[PDB]
Amino acid sequence: GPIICAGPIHSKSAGIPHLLGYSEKICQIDRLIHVSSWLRNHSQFQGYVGQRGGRSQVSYYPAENSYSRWSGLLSPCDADWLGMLVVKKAKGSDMIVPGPSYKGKVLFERPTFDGYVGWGCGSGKSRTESGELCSSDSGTSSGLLPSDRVLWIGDVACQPMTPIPEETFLELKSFSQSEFPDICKIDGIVFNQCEGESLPQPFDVAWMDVGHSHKIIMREHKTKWVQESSSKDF
Amino acid sequence: SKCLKIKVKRINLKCKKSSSYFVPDARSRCTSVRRCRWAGDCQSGCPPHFTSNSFSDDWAGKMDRAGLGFSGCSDGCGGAACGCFNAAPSCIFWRKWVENPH
Amino acid sequence: GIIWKVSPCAAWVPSAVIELTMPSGEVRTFHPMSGIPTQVFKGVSVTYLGS
């Protein structure tokens, strides 16, 4: 449920400020306070997000997510307030995944080959369909929502790193191409130069970011779980 | 009036296709996700049931590039040697892939 | 205890000793059962049956 506390409920026009303290912002991340700040910066709406929500009711498109149960794990959209990674806007060349049902949404994530993409609609521009068009409606005037406007695709576990030599990064990309003879073009980004292609395909493979531009995918990887007492992890 | 001719060409010893099957080329590939107790919070007794198709431990359920691969736990490491400071043993899930690259 | 390990192959197929030398300069040794169409997996390349 709650990492530290249950997020406060304030009856909407309030700009939640920065806190220098490290252990104070974590329960604010529990409150989904940061994603509301993303709206004020790019969507330009003062909609408080997740009253009573926290991290105990947020659901993702997968039917069962083990990572959602372990709220200690850190989400890509939650790594933006802490400063490791950043989510950006969506380009016209970028398109939706027809996987989930976009009902009553304003902000949903999509990790990509390059980075993390967040999409926005207007406050009152209700998202009642999977399309890009946002539809006006008066039913979402109230800001109370059990993560209805916040649906997150993917099951991503985030953590700090120690970077790798540029040569080590180069080994993965070449080997990844070898592992995937058929995959040639991904998201328009070149993976292997090939001939003419068909456009429509939902593609879902495991990936990993090592701090480099090209994402690394795998099919025969072996993960390893070790936990150590780190002052950041307290 | 009309007619009909039938021409023969060869004599040989063949036999009819009673059945038909294809044989791909199997390669045995396997991964291993290595949890330890209180970190994956798996039970003291390994669950006798295994969903060989979903595998919710790693990205819930999607397409498995193996054809009905098996599943299971493993023996346990416990202590500072494996780092997650539990003296209790550890459960490890394993996969098996049959793959035909070329 | 005195412990024995066993395996019932119940067959006999010719095999050879093979040294591999990747063009980068790396070398890998392995015992492939070249009598059968076995596929030993290493690096990028795979060898298989012989005569």
Partner: peptide, 28 residues
């Protein structure tokens, strides 16, 4: 007749003289 199948490799990419020195003995 050992053979190998090829996957997705990592293939990499002036003056020179031969200047033989000697010859040994074999035929057949």
């Amino acid at each position: 007749d050992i053979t190998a199948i090829r996957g997705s490799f990592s293939v990499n990419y002036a003056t020179c003289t031969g200047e033989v020195t000697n010859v040994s003995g074999c035929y057949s």
